[PDB]
């Protein structure tokens, strides 16, 4: 996988953030994890610890996985990057996600995600308290 750049152009929620790619503006949604809804518990920490993430960033990438790009809303499926530490990864490390949504050959950092779920909980972190 390679990673490409993007910028932010403003942040919505715990796993979907508005950027721009190829100097188009375009929905990402985060592969491999589900955070809560805002209206959910854990949701508002999710979105602000992603806000955090993304707004901070000086550089901003995306990294497709191996098959599908878009999903059936339109929403870009990506890993994304925030000065070259995933966010997909740092959420669910600080028990703000699960692992879900793992289809087929977009699957890439599976294992990864889920070593960093399995430390967060073993903490007992925020969902896994
Ligand atoms: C993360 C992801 C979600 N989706 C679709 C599945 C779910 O469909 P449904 O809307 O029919 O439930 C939805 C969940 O996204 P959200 O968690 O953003 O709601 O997005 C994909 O198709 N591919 C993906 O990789
Ligand atoms: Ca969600």
Same mark, same amino acid.
């Given at each position: 996988?390679?990673?490409?750049?993007?910028?932010?152009?403003?942040?919505?929620?715990?796993?979907?953030?508005?950027?721009?790619?190829?100097?188009?503006?375009?929905?990402?949604?985060?592969?491999?994890?589900?955070?809560?809804?805002?209206?959910? /518990?854990?949701?508002?920490?999710?979105?602000?610890?992603?806000? $955090?993430?993304?707004?901070? *960033? +000086? %550089?901003?990438?995306?990294?497709?996985?191996?098959?599908?790009?878009?999903?059936?809303?339109?929403?870009?499926?990506?890993?994304?990057?925030?000065?070259?530490?995933?966010?997909?990864?740092?959420?669910?490390?600080?028990?703000?996600?699960?692992?879900?949504?793992?289809? /087929?050959?977009?699957?890439?950092?599976?294992?990864?995600?889920? $070593?960093?779920?399995?430390? *967060? +909980? %073993?903490?007992?972190?925020?969902?896994?308290?």
């Amino acid at each position: 996988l390679h990673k490409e750049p993007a910028t932010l152009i403003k942040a919505i929620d715990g796993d979907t953030k508005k950027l721009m790619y190829k100097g188009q503006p375009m929905t990402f949604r985060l592969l491999l994890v589900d955070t809560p809804e805002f209206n959910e /518990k854990y949701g508002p920490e999710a979105s602000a610890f992603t806000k $955090k993430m993304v707004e901070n *960033a +000086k %550089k901003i990438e995306v990294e497709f996985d191996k098959g599908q790009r878009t999903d059936k809303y339109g929403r870009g499926l990506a890993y994304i990057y925030a000065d070259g530490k995933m966010v997909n990864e740092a959420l669910v490390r600080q028990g703000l996600a699960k692992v879900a949504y793992v289809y /087929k050959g977009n699957n890439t950092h599976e294992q990864l995600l889920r $070593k960093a779920e399995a430390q *967060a +909980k %073993k903490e007992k972190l925020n969902i896994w308290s």
